[PDB]
Symmetry: D2
Subunit: 122 residues, 4 copies
């Protein structure tokens, strides 16, 4: 939790996420996607369990990114739900949901699901 | 977007979520789950597309809740990814991922997936 | 389980699914999607818990459809995982994953996730 | 497609899946989970795109397993949706939904979501 989450992480797609975990569960930072209709950095906000468990369990967290910045607007948002595992080789394992804004008719195909693993090394 | 999202919403489980959408894509508020290991209100933070599309598409958004407050700590976090549809009958349709902090061994079963529909009326 | 699953079901999109549940957990039938790149009927196969629980719980089941038939080939497959609830108003509540065949590069966006509710009445 | 899918695959959890892909899109075989409330082999059935795309894309497929056999009954079912990539290092990348049969009240927590990568070598 806290101390260990803050920093720069990289996932297998080459995206970068920089976060600051605050004392009381908040997560703030920027995300730069290596793929998709995105350019540069986007703002992210989230929450994490600041009082994780005796035991060697992971810390649960989640964050969101709306794919709109000053360069592009993809009219979509991604939320990543996962857990942080610290240690020699700390990682954040997640599953994500990417929803695009659609018309009611195309709503059945509005969401992509995937998973990303983030490490401190890339 | 913006104006229309702010307020109190209720989903089919009887949970309540109160949010304020800010001018530049931020979402802030509290969530009270009617089910699960939760008691009272939890803080939520998220993001939404403040510049949605000509067209009648939904606005994409997402938010997170870490299930830790002053009463309980479930060591879990939920992220909801969906879109807001305004109108006579405005709703927010979402899919969610609820991750619990586990030991590496039980990580395969760390995440629940579901969907919630929120309305302004309950 | 068994007896009760067999028949024609309809979901909220207007798709039709006809299945036969066999004595030992098998599910067979055809699916006709009302949306997407599909035309006519596609073959489906799956499995269900033939020995469900004392109790009023649902029966777990799942099935798959590859979107290739004699009219079209969408190079995709959908799997529905859910449970059957019998009674006056029997329904099958599910969550589905629709994966399209992509090049390694676009694999992160290969899967859509959604949910469908099927009833015996449409 | 076809020829290349048939065989024994192993995923990162140590589970084994043996399948036979039939000429016209069917998948049949057995699954042995290394984790969970399962013992020995379970029957699986599924479908795959027998006429995949010029191009180097993956073949879409999906299969289901109901966790009931002669030794145990977990009253649950898993469906895996993913794609097969052949080559020197062929793999099947998937995302899965595991639904347990619950009472209507606990249905919101009836489904786990995860991802598995299968290889021909373990
Ligand atoms: O195309 C879009 O809608 C905007 C970019 C989405 C990029 C996604 S979010 C999940 C996956 N992980 C990443 O780092 N990037 C892609
Ligand atoms: O049990 C827990 O881990 C904490 C409560 C989780 C409640 C979930 S989040 C999704 C679903 N929608 C709700 O409003 N509540 C449940
Ligand atoms: O476009 C395709 O790839 C083929 C059709 C997919 C239709 C999907 S599967 C889930 C949802 N429920 C339906 O009945 N149809 C759509
Ligand atoms: O506990 C159960 O309900 C039965 C076993 C479920 C095992 C799951 S399915 C997905 C994941 N991949 C595996 O090979 N095993 C676990």
């Amino acid at each position: 939790a806290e101390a260990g989450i803050t920093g720069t992480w990289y996932n297998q797609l080459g995206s970068t996420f920089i976060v600051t975990a605050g004392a009381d569960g908040a997560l703030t930072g920027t995300y730069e996607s290596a793929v998709g209709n995105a350019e540069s950095r986007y703002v992210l906000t989230g929450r994490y369990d600041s009082a994780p468990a005796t035991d060697g369990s992971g810390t649960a967290l989640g964050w969101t990114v709306a794919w709109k910045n000053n360069y592009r607007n993809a009219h979509s948002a991604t939320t990543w739900s996962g857990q942080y595992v610290g240690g020699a080789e700390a990682r954040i394992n997640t599953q994500w949901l990417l929803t695009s804004g659609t018309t009611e008719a195309n709503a059945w195909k509005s969401t992509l699901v995937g998973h990303d693993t983030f490490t401190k090394v890339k």
